[PDB]
């Protein structure tokens, strides 16, 4: 999705909106650390 942003920004925003995600969720560094699983209540 970051490549899609670098290539076709309009389709990038369309796709992330359709999939239920935002720009921050794609661009920001992400690890499935215990902090994420606690904050978002994965379990």
């Amino acid at each position: 999705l970051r490549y899609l942003k670098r290539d076709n920004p309009e389709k990038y925003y369309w796709t992330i909106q359709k999939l239920g995600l935002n720009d921050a969720a794609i661009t920001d560094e992400f690890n499935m650390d215990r902090r994420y699983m606690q904050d978002y209540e994965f379990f």
Binding site: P9, E10, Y12, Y13, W14, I16, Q17, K18, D23
Partner: protein, 101 residues
């Protein structure tokens, strides 16, 4: 570009924007939101319609009744609901003719 001191730490001012990628990234965002809403609504309408069709919902028995006929009233009702060939024409034939084309 260089400028008089405008604050403690600010000594430069923008002069022009060669690439408007940052500007476009918000216009496209809003447009994507607006378009996704309407496309969602349309596809949800289609799904609800299909649910209604499946709610409304015997082809073998019906076709056999037409075949044996070749009684009159039920036959007419089934007609409203080579005719056997038309009612059983399969999408695979369309694929075959398209491939040949």
């Amino acid at each position: 570009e260089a400028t008089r001191p405008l604050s403690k730490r600010k000594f430069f001012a923008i002069a022009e924007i060669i690439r408007n990628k940052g500007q476009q990234f918000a216009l496209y965002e809003s447009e994507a939101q607006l378009s996704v809403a309407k496309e969602e609504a349309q596809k949800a309408k289609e799904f609800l319609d299909k649910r209604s069709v499946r709610e409304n919902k015997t082809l073998l028995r019906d076709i056999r009744t037409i075949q044996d006929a070749l009684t009159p009233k039920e036959l007419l009702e089934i007609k409203q609901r080579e005719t056997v060939r038309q009612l059983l024409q399969l999408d695979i034939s369309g694929l075959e003719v398209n491939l040949e084309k």
